[PDB]
Write an enzyme that holds these catalytic residues in place. Structure first.
Site, mmCIF file in Angstrom:
data_model
loop_
_atom_site.group_PDB
_atom_site.id
_atom_site.type_symbol
_atom_site.label_atom_id
_atom_site.label_comp_id
_atom_site.label_asym_id
_atom_site.label_seq_id
_atom_site.Cartn_x
_atom_site.Cartn_y
_atom_site.Cartn_z
ATOM 1 N N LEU A 99 34.962 -12.500 26.154
ATOM 2 C CA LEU A 99 33.834 -11.797 26.760
ATOM 3 C C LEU A 99 34.178 -10.393 27.236
ATOM 4 O O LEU A 99 33.336 -9.741 27.864
ATOM 5 C CB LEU A 99 33.255 -12.589 27.939
ATOM 6 C CG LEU A 99 32.546 -13.908 27.638
ATOM 7 C CD1 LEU A 99 32.063 -14.522 28.922
ATOM 8 C CD2 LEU A 99 31.385 -13.739 26.663
ATOM 9 N N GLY A 100 35.372 -9.904 26.948
ATOM 10 C CA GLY A 100 35.776 -8.590 27.401
ATOM 11 C C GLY A 100 36.613 -8.644 28.663
ATOM 12 O O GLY A 100 37.097 -9.692 29.101
ATOM 13 N N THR A 101 36.772 -7.469 29.260
ATOM 14 C CA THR A 101 37.692 -7.268 30.368
ATOM 15 C C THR A 101 36.920 -6.727 31.558
ATOM 16 O O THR A 101 36.093 -5.823 31.403
ATOM 17 C CB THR A 101 38.810 -6.304 29.975
ATOM 18 O OG1 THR A 101 39.602 -6.900 28.943
ATOM 19 C CG2 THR A 101 39.704 -5.975 31.170
ATOM 20 N N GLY A 102 37.190 -7.287 32.733
ATOM 21 C CA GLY A 102 36.594 -6.817 33.963
ATOM 22 C C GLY A 102 37.652 -6.309 34.917
ATOM 23 O O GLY A 102 38.788 -6.055 34.510
ATOM 24 N N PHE A 107 39.385 -7.777 37.066
ATOM 25 C CA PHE A 107 40.536 -8.662 37.185
ATOM 26 C C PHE A 107 41.104 -9.083 35.835
ATOM 27 O O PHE A 107 41.881 -10.041 35.779
ATOM 28 C CB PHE A 107 40.174 -9.908 37.990
ATOM 29 C CG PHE A 107 39.742 -9.627 39.397
ATOM 30 C CD1 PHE A 107 40.617 -9.053 40.308
ATOM 31 C CD2 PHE A 107 38.469 -9.957 39.819
ATOM 32 C CE1 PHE A 107 40.209 -8.800 41.614
ATOM 33 C CE2 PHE A 107 38.061 -9.712 41.113
ATOM 34 C CZ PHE A 107 38.939 -9.137 42.018
ATOM 35 N N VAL A 149 40.997 -10.286 31.689
ATOM 36 C CA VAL A 149 40.262 -10.899 30.595
ATOM 37 C C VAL A 149 39.289 -11.937 31.139
ATOM 38 O O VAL A 149 39.591 -12.670 32.091
ATOM 39 C CB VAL A 149 41.242 -11.524 29.589
ATOM 40 C CG1 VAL A 149 40.491 -12.235 28.478
ATOM 41 C CG2 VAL A 149 42.147 -10.446 29.010
ATOM 42 N N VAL A 150 38.111 -12.005 30.525
ATOM 43 C CA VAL A 150 37.134 -13.050 30.804
ATOM 44 C C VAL A 150 36.773 -13.703 29.481
ATOM 45 O O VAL A 150 36.594 -13.017 28.469
ATOM 46 C CB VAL A 150 35.874 -12.499 31.503
ATOM 47 C CG1 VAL A 150 34.876 -13.626 31.804
ATOM 48 C CG2 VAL A 150 36.263 -11.769 32.785
ATOM 49 N N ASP A 155 29.372 -4.761 46.248
ATOM 50 C CA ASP A 155 29.304 -3.917 45.061
ATOM 51 C C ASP A 155 28.072 -4.296 44.247
ATOM 52 O O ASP A 155 28.140 -4.548 43.043
ATOM 53 C CB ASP A 155 30.596 -4.029 44.249
ATOM 54 C CG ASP A 155 30.762 -2.908 43.228
ATOM 55 O OD1 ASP A 155 29.821 -2.110 43.015
ATOM 56 O OD2 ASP A 155 31.858 -2.825 42.638
ATOM 57 N N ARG A 196 25.348 -3.117 36.937
ATOM 58 C CA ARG A 196 26.518 -3.565 36.196
ATOM 59 C C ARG A 196 27.058 -4.888 36.716
ATOM 60 O O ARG A 196 27.796 -5.566 35.999
ATOM 61 C CB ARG A 196 27.620 -2.506 36.249
ATOM 62 C CG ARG A 196 28.137 -2.252 37.640
ATOM 63 C CD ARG A 196 29.297 -1.280 37.699
ATOM 64 N NE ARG A 196 29.580 -1.035 39.107
ATOM 65 C CZ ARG A 196 28.873 -0.202 39.859
ATOM 66 N NH1 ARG A 196 27.900 0.512 39.321
ATOM 67 N NH2 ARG A 196 29.148 -0.064 41.142
ATOM 68 N N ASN A 197 26.726 -5.260 37.950
ATOM 69 C CA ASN A 197 27.159 -6.517 38.545
ATOM 70 C C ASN A 197 25.999 -7.495 38.718
ATOM 71 O O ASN A 197 25.993 -8.332 39.630
ATOM 72 C CB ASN A 197 27.867 -6.260 39.869
ATOM 73 C CG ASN A 197 29.164 -5.500 39.677
ATOM 74 O OD1 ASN A 197 29.903 -5.739 38.715
ATOM 75 N ND2 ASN A 197 29.435 -4.565 40.570
ATOM 76 N N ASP A 245 29.505 -11.766 40.958
ATOM 77 C CA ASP A 245 30.766 -11.280 41.541
ATOM 78 C C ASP A 245 30.606 -10.757 42.970
ATOM 79 O O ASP A 245 31.338 -9.868 43.426
ATOM 80 C CB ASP A 245 31.394 -10.240 40.620
ATOM 81 C CG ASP A 245 31.801 -10.847 39.284
ATOM 82 O OD1 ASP A 245 32.295 -11.996 39.294
ATOM 83 O OD2 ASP A 245 31.606 -10.202 38.235
HETATM 84 C C1 LIG Z 1 29.587 -14.834 33.863
HETATM 85 N N1 LIG Z 1 29.767 -13.748 32.884
HETATM 86 C C2 LIG Z 1 30.705 -12.777 33.100
HETATM 87 C C3 LIG Z 1 30.892 -11.757 32.197
HETATM 88 C C4 LIG Z 1 31.951 -10.734 32.457
HETATM 89 C C5 LIG Z 1 32.828 -10.381 31.412
HETATM 90 C C6 LIG Z 1 33.847 -9.464 31.606
HETATM 91 N N2 LIG Z 1 34.015 -8.899 32.788
HETATM 92 C C7 LIG Z 1 33.241 -9.208 33.811
HETATM 93 N N3 LIG Z 1 33.419 -8.606 35.054
HETATM 94 N N4 LIG Z 1 32.768 -7.387 35.225
HETATM 95 C C8 LIG Z 1 32.821 -6.728 36.328
HETATM 96 C C9 LIG Z 1 33.523 -7.276 37.472
HETATM 97 C C10 LIG Z 1 33.513 -6.598 38.686
HETATM 98 C C11 LIG Z 1 34.162 -7.114 39.779
HETATM 99 C C12 LIG Z 1 34.121 -6.352 41.075
HETATM 100 C C13 LIG Z 1 35.160 -6.926 42.039
HETATM 101 C C14 LIG Z 1 32.723 -6.478 41.681
HETATM 102 C C15 LIG Z 1 34.428 -4.879 40.816
HETATM 103 C C16 LIG Z 1 34.828 -8.325 39.675
HETATM 104 C C17 LIG Z 1 34.848 -9.020 38.472
HETATM 105 F F1 LIG Z 1 35.497 -10.200 38.392
HETATM 106 C C18 LIG Z 1 34.219 -8.499 37.340
HETATM 107 C C19 LIG Z 1 34.158 -9.180 36.033
HETATM 108 O O1 LIG Z 1 34.733 -10.252 35.844
HETATM 109 C C20 LIG Z 1 32.187 -10.127 33.703
HETATM 110 C C21 LIG Z 1 31.297 -10.394 34.899
HETATM 111 O O2 LIG Z 1 31.729 -11.430 35.774
HETATM 112 C C22 LIG Z 1 30.094 -11.737 31.016
HETATM 113 C C23 LIG Z 1 29.164 -12.728 30.820
HETATM 114 N N5 LIG Z 1 28.331 -12.848 29.702
HETATM 115 C C24 LIG Z 1 28.377 -12.150 28.552
HETATM 116 O O3 LIG Z 1 29.172 -11.258 28.361
HETATM 117 C C25 LIG Z 1 27.375 -12.526 27.495
HETATM 118 C C26 LIG Z 1 27.861 -12.329 26.064
HETATM 119 C C27 LIG Z 1 26.733 -11.455 26.623
HETATM 120 F F2 LIG Z 1 27.036 -10.124 26.914
HETATM 121 C C28 LIG Z 1 29.016 -13.755 31.774
HETATM 122 O O4 LIG Z 1 28.186 -14.643 31.585
#
Ligand SMILES: Cn1cc(-c2ccnc(-n3ncc4cc(C(C)(C)C)cc(F)c4c3=O)c2CO)cc(NC(=O)[C@@H]2C[C@@H]2F)c1=O
Length: 264
Positions: A14-17, A19, A21-22, A127, A131-132, A145
């Protein structure tokens, strides 16, 4: 609550956030989940584990639920609800020519309901921004988040002059004193409403972060988006009172939004 990692099946990246890889996967072969793999060094892990029970106990239809964690190996996992349509910001931009204004107001209601719940639990998001927020397969927006910003180890994010700090979603008292409260979430919610009604534009586009801080400190506010009625703009604008105690509660904001829906 401690999830058995043997119960998780990884299926898709699902990409990188913030923290790392997700992944998308399933729990016990049935339930769709997202699994954050917390990159070592990216999170104050002892602090998060020590304080994570309250976060898992936050239960509301419009929150992206934190189901549990895996902490008996490294990297640790955070397991959450899965949202098939992804980030609200991308969703707004990809469907921007189709939305009716009633759908935009419904997105605001979705988020406001989630934030009223967090407010009632005295729990800060810290936050809040498009985007969140995430969108599920039926178009329901949920807040994602919440609370995790407290555990970020990244000076570019934790410093108010860092490049990742959410300056454009921050009230004056955060930018000057790092005074987070319910009322800084209120301010961010107003900016989020603006993001929704502008169909995913960047707030204060072409301003730098420091220019944004300078000019909102002097009273500059985001303009009314074309698709926002005056009543809708009045709601988002009420979130941006310079003085935090003049800002509404999420309970009041929800009442305002429902009044507009009723009139419509
Ligand atoms: C539950 N979830 C999470 C994600 C996903 C993926 C990658 N990075 C993230 N991220 N971003 C941003 C993020 C931001 C933070 C702070 C601490 C607030 C800065 C903390 C995080 F920890 C994250 C994170 O972890 C997420 C967001 O949690 C994507 C989903 N779905 C899809 O991608 C569907 C295929 C369609 F597009 C989904 O369902």
């Amino acid at each position: 609550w401690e999830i058995d990692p043997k119960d998780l099946t990884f299926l898709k990246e699902l990409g990188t956030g913030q923290f790392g890889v997700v992944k998308y996967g399933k729990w016990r072969g049935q339930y769709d989940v997202a699994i954050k793999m917390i990159k070592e060094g990216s999170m104050s892990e002892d602090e998060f584990i020590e304080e994570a029970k309250v976060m898992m106990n936050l239960s509301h239809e419009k929150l992206v639920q934190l189901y549990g964690v895996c902490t008996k190996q490294r990297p640790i996992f955070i397991i959450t609800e899965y949202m098939a349509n992804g980030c609200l910001l991308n969703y707004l931009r990809e469907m921007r020519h189709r939305f009716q204004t009633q759908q935009l107001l419904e997105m605001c209601k979705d988020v406001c309901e989630a934030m009223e719940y967090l407010e009632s639990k005295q729990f800060l998001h810290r936050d809040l921004a498009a985007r969140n927020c995430l969108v599920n397969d039926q178009g329901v927006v949920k807040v994602s988040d919440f609370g995790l910003s407290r555990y970020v180890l990244d000076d570019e994010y934790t410093s108010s002059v860092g490049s990742k700090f959410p300056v454009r979603w921050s009230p004056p008292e955060v930018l000057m004193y790092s005074k987070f409260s319910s009322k800084s979430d209120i301010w961010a919610f107003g900016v989020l409403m603006w993001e929704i009604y502008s169909l995913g534009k960047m707030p204060y586009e072409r301003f730098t972060n420091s220019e944004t801080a300078e000019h909102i400190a002097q009273g500059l506010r985001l303009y009314r988006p074309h698709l926002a009625s005056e009543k809708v703009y009045t709601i988002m604008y009420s979130c941006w009172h310079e003085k935090a105690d003049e800002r509404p509660t999420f309970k009041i904001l929800l009442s305002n939004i429902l009044d507009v829906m009723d009139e419509n």
